[PDB]
């Protein structure tokens, strides 16, 4: 059963084992059951923590239903893979990734008064060879000020930094003037769409190149895992993979009554159904009731 | 697909481009006289203008029946297509069994025959471990949990450095 | 038995989702009571 905060996260979700939890709840409200009152409680810390642990119950089955585009040629299987993660994060309640990491910067550094503190409280979320490349620019601009640069914007010393911080961002490859003119808007919507269509060709070149960099790491992890495995004899592999299957059944068979472990062994029995159903008719595949 | 679509017998395909399907439709102003033939079978019915519009009323919603998951199959398919590239260079190995005769035995230096009989025993080591295709399913499960924990991010599943850098210049170069 | 379903077969099997749920059922009631009993 659900606690109604799960079933509100599973309404716009699309995966299987959540939508059969929604369809079983939507059939119960139809049969004369009353809907629970949604609690207007658990102030800002518990409210943003339940969002962390309810969106991860939408992301986690959703990531497993997204086929990686490994060993593929072209940019369209990466634009498929990234768009499946865009539409997955939207079903889990996330916003656009540009909107969601810019929210992460202003959350970490609401009280950062110096530019060296905003470069060290948003350190985990910026590429480290870009964060370091903004420290040679911060140390160069610190020479002509000889005082700490403040996070003001109206300060002239911040404009001396942002004259050379923008100089890195174009050299990194990202058009900072098309980013900044997108999030500022424009007056007329005709020239607001000339910057919208140049932000979204950066952004589509942005979300692809790190969806592709996520694939090329899985391609290089699977090729180093396989080439470590092709060097073994076949008898070593058969007993190494039989102990790992035994110790991980045993970890789920010791934990009894837990929800995850009794759902784990229903997956082992459903894997064995797939092998048993293919073994009965292998030119057609598994048998679906249809 | 959306709830309302706007396609059917208007700029439709009237002729097939293959030979295994020969399709010809007769575009009446109201209806369409279709005739499709595939080998020995012939089907010639009639569809209306409003009968193609009700087709997209209920959606098919094709979904994949995978053994473990769709993610896991995409890693195992890559390991299978990697295990084929290594099988292809075990296919170009020279036939050592054409030199198993005793007229190659007794002509050869005895240490260069131990090396040759161990180079043949190494091929059967390499060939029996690259055709162990039942081992590739449990290899793809060593790639899944590190990948799925990267997608279980606190920012976004689809976030990476290039988006987060370009959203840092929007954050930094605006006034705090 | 045989010939199960489609919506039973579409679920990805060994995803976590119930470790995340088991943590969220043991973290949330154990931290809802922490915020209502907190003085420095």
């Amino acid at each position: 059963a659900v606690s109604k905060k799960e079933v509100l996260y599973f309404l716009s979700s699309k995966d299987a084992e959540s939508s059969t939890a929604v369809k079983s709840y939507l059939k119960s409200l139809y049969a004369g059951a009353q809907v629970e009152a949604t609690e207007t409680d658990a102030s800002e810390l518990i409210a943003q923590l339940e969002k962390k642990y309810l969106s991860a119950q939408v992301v986690e089955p959703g990531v497993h239903n997204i086929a990686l585009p490994l060993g593929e040629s072209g940019s369209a299987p990466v634009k498929r893979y990234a768009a499946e993660l865009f539409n997955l994060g939207a079903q889990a309640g996330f916003e656009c990734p540009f909107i969601e990491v810019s929210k992460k910067f202003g959350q970490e550094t609401a009280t950062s008064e110096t530019v060296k503190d905003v470069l060290n409280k948003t350190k985990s979320y910026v590429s480290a060879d870009y964060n370091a490349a903004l420290n040679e620019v911060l140390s160069s601009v610190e020479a002509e000020i000889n005082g700490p640069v403040l996070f003001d914007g109206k300060t002239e010393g911040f404009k001396k930094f942002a004259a050379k911080a923008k100089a890195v961002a174009v050299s990194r490859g990202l058009p900072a003037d098309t980013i900044l003119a997108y999030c500022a808007g424009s007056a007329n919507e005709d020239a607001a769409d000339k910057v919208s269509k140049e932000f979204f060709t950066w952004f589509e070149s942005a979300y692809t190149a790190d969806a592709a960099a996520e694939v090329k790491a899985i391609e290089a992890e699977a090729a180093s895992i396989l080439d470590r495995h092709l060097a073994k004899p076949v008898a070593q592999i058969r007993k190494e993979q039989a102990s790992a299957y035994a110790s991980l059944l045993k970890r789920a068979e010791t934990a009894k009554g837990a929800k995850w472990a009794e759902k784990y062994l229903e997956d082992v029995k459903a894997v064995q159904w797939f092998d048993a159903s293919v073994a009965e008719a292998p030119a057609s595949g598994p048998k679906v009731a249809a | 697909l959306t709830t309302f679509t706007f396609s059917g017998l208007q700029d439709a395909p009237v002729a097939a481009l293959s030979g295994s399907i020969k399709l010809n439709v007769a575009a009446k102003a109201g209806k369409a006289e279709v005739t499709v033939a595939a080998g020995a079978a012939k089907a010639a019915t009639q569809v209306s203008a409003a009968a193609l519009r009700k087709l997209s009323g209920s959606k098919i919603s094709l979904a994949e029946v995978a053994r473990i998951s769709v993610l896991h199959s995409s890693i195992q398919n890559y390991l299978l297509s990697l295990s084929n590239e290594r099988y292809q260079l075990l296919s170009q190995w020279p036939d050592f069994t054409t030199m198993y005769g005793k007229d190659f035995y007794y002509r050869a230096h005895p240490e260069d025959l131990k090396k040759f009989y161990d180079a043949a025993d190494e091929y059967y080591k390499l060939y029996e471990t690259v055709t162990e295709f039942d081992s590739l399913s449990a290899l793809a499960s060593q790639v899944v949990p590190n990948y799925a924990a990267r997608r279980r991010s606190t920012v976004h599943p689809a976030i990476g450095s290039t988006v987060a850098d370009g959203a840092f210049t929007n954050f930094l170069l605006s006034k705090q | 038995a045989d010939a199960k379903a489609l919506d039973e077969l579409r679920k990805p099997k060994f995803s976590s989702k119930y470790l995340i749920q088991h943590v969220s059922q043991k973290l949330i009631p154990a931290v809802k009571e922490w915020e209502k009993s907190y003085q420095p």
Partner: peptide, 30 residues
């Protein structure tokens, strides 16, 4: 075929650490 379940989150946004190419394609050619 089955993997250990993890319930943990990624706090950082990092590059995905492309591993090094193994030597197996040329040592099997040796």
């Amino acid at each position: 075929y089955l993997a250990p379940l993890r319930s943990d989150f990624t706090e950082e946004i990092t590059a995905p650490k492309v591993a090094s190419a193994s030597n197996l394609v040329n040592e099997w050619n040796n």
